[PDB]
Design a protein around this ligand. Sequence first.
Ligand SMILES: [Cl-]
Ligand SMILES: [Cl-]
Ligand SMILES: [Cl-]
Ligand SMILES: [Cl-]
Ligand SMILES: [Zn+2]
Ligand SMILES: [Zn+2]
Ligand SMILES: [Zn+2]
Ligand SMILES: [Zn+2]
Lengths: 287, 286, 286, 287
Amino acid sequence: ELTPAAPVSWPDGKTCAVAFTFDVDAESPLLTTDPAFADRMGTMSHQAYGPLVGVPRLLGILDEFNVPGTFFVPGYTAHRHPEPIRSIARAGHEIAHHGYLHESLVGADEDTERKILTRGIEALEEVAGVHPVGYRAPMWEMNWHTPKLLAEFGFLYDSTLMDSDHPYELAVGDGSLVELPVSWALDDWQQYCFVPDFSGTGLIETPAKAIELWRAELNAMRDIGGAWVLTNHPFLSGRPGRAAALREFIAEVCAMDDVWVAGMSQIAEHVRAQKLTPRTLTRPELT
Amino acid sequence: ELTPAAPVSWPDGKTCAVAFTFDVDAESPLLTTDPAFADRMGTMSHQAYGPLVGVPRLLGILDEFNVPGTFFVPGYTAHRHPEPIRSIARAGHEIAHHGYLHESLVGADEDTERKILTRGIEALEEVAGVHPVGYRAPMWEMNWHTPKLLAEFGFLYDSTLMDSDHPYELAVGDGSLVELPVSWALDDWQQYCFVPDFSGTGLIETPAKAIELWRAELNAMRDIGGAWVLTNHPFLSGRPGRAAALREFIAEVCAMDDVWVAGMSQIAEHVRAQKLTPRTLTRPEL
Amino acid sequence: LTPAAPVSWPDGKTCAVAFTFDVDAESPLLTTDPAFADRMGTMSHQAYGPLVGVPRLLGILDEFNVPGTFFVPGYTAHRHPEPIRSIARAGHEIAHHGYLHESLVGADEDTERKILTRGIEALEEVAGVHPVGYRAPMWEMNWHTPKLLAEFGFLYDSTLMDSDHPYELAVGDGSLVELPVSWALDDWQQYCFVPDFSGTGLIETPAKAIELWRAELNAMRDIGGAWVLTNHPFLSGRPGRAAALREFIAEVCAMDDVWVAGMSQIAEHVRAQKLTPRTLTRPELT
Amino acid sequence: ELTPAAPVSWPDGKTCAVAFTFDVDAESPLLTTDPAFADRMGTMSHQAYGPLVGVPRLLGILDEFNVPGTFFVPGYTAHRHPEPIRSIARAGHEIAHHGYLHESLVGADEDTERKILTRGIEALEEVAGVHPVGYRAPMWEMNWHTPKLLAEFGFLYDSTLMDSDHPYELAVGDGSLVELPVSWALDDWQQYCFVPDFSGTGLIETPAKAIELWRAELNAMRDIGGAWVLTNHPFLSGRPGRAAALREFIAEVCAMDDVWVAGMSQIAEHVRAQKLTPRTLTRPELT
Ligand SMILES: [Cl-]
Ligand SMILES: [Cl-]
Ligand SMILES: [Cl-]
Ligand SMILES: [Cl-]
Ligand SMILES: [Zn+2]
Ligand SMILES: [Zn+2]
Ligand SMILES: [Zn+2]
Ligand SMILES: [Zn+2]
């Protein structure tokens, strides 16, 4: 009988936790899908906007409001854009693992996954001297064998699963891994992404519509007392109008006295110190 | 030949019937489409949210306003999430049939469909102690022979067809079957669903826009006097922002003096008592 | 290739409005794939058009004494004769829309002729009417189609999108009025969701669809064109959509600069102006 | 070491540049994808609306507010619609290059691309007596070798790339070429286009929603100080409702004292006079 995740107690009289997170995907989701995307200068320029413009713009916004940010960086982004990635670490923001070439884990065996985890840790170490304690699977998809590899690599937390509003201890072998759950609604990819021959049907929402959608989710989460995890991509949300609406929303959230605006590893550490009973879903069985 | 469905008289001065229905699809629509979806821990975690989080949240909302909900539960959902499905029965809400592994009926022969009906019935009996009197076809698609299978199985009603605003008696020979019609617009799936490689192009509507769409339909349905059947999925509408907007909408509907907020079997028994002349569409001939 | 000039409107009017309806029902699906006939759920959704949408929309047109033009595939007429007859008894024009709503992509002149005759014969035999108007199914036709239409003595075509103003299509020895349309003045892109056939799942609120048509209309009033709206009873006939359309019709009826007319009446006004015929020609390559 | 583009200084104390641009695509994007689109009288009539109706409607609106516009004209459009294209030159607006038959550059070698540049220039010269100094790649996609071709053909600027909010000088060796960057958000195609069997899913936005999107972007660009380049297609934005909404947006923009509303060559010459250090992205390397 799988228990649903229960509410966690938050610190400092706070009753909701909020994390602003950024997946610095840049070119990597396209290159892993089809390496011939490398030849598309137009498309590669749209992707390069994230690390080149979006990353400094978003860091200026986080710094204006003294907000911790968590940047999930694919190792290949770090190798192709080391000055943008180092600027994140230099600004004092946490960097977390997001694969090497943002590889799909669908069909991946344990050995393939283990090589990608090493390759991403080494790139982030080389480029920015960071050893990530956090992970998010590219494309928010992972295998039933993935958490044990994350445990083997000593990761503090994962932020990939969507079966809860509350953080929890994901049971892994004879231990656990903190889970900081996400949702497709709390992602700018479905709001702004348009990349011909790759992603998006042509629908490009207004920045007000996107904030509206997140604000309705946040107000509800404040009543639930969960961990509200927002995911944005610098090549999308770093654009002028979207960044300007995220800045206004961030100002609004920092003004909420009931909310703990925090880094992902700080959230995960606070959860870990609660010594919760681990839980996990199991693979669906079919006769 | 074929007549349109005529309005039914609602009980005790009510002039519109409203039914809040929930399809506890969870993993099953993906698993029948491709069993390899079982390997996707992420997608499976998104689908498990429905029974784990969506179902208690929605029960809490239905409870706050004393609203009856009808929960269409595939047999597989009941077998994989027995506690949430048992929680629905214990709360006093109706459980109705929705296949076993939410199978598509497209191309299913009568025997294939009978075997699925049996399998779903046995699952809901086993897990929840329920024998459903209501049926909704997975993916809202059935065969010209399905109504006669449902009648043969003793179902009170079907809630799959969309040729009417008014409930009616579906012509099935010597048997009897009430039809409680639905429509694609009164479904949250086209408003909120996004599951890569399965369904959804990326469009995720705000909760206010989905309520706005449903309220325009409900206010117009109140002038028509039909049966307004809303279908939500717990893994979609159970999300915080969406359930909060649903909650407010349900309060609003409870304040409509003219509307009868009822369970699906209560609506179907009222329709059955009117003794309507049966009717049916027939397969197009080419 | 000269652009179409503004046409003079009668007496004090400076702009024409035509409310049109394509009673497509089952036919676009059945021609795309005959196996759609086995889909009872989908077949019930398309049947709503003739069964429910047509009397609702006829009722609204009656309340505001608005003439409507109904483009009816011959198949819809044979499958739904009473809904089609009911249009003609209400005094509204019935126009040609193929037989089984066939795509004209890749058809030779003989295939298009046979279809033209089949549709005329169905509308004559079912409703005792003879169409003077034509609109290609899927709004697509061949460069050889205007000549075929002129040969069948049609008064007008309503398919082309190269002008805001009606015009005389060059067809040699014959005559043929074009009353142009546009994708923005279609409800299909606003409301259509049929699994395995049309829509990505996007379903717009009725207010959004009216806001979009109203933007166009208000601009067309300054241009002096012919604003031709296209709606499908299986879509716009739904409670919420029909209600917002009714309020929109009430609003258009209070615009004294606007001529709200039937399509053959607009076409006969245009024909009386004795315009110089024009036509686009097939783009030639290298 | 790639540096992001720096802000440029604008004239007359302005702090933002704005360009109204139009791609007179007409029939050409469809005819290059599949020549059988020529048989489709309905679809061809929809495309012919751009040059027959949209071009004189948009020229009337530009004339009303004394706004320069830049029209990117495929050479095929000039040949099929010479009078609408000539009317653009007569009204004094700039005409720029957009291929011949709006050809995709995906898989194009430099010879195929040079032959298209020549075909396009000769069609524009023969039709409207104009020699284009501007270029935009059909489908906003080009090869890593395209900028050098543009410099060698004597082009002043390109407006295809998306790695910057600011104009910059592209690294093209001994030659020179201004980049006037663009964005998918500042395009009407994603907002209004529905062409069966070619482009669009059925989503057709209201004109107020498109304008809302572009104004959120423009307001944020005014604080950034870049060049906000709008792209519209007469066959889409020339429609009564869309043109009327564009007309009122242009009136609002002419009322902004901080904005420089200009032609693309006017903006590019002002950039070129600043003598910026050339920069360029490089092809992603994959091991
Ligand atoms: Cl990025
Ligand atoms: Cl569910
Ligand atoms: Cl219809
Ligand atoms: Cl155009
Ligand atoms: Zn990612
Ligand atoms: Zn279902
Ligand atoms: Zn049609
Ligand atoms: Zn173009």
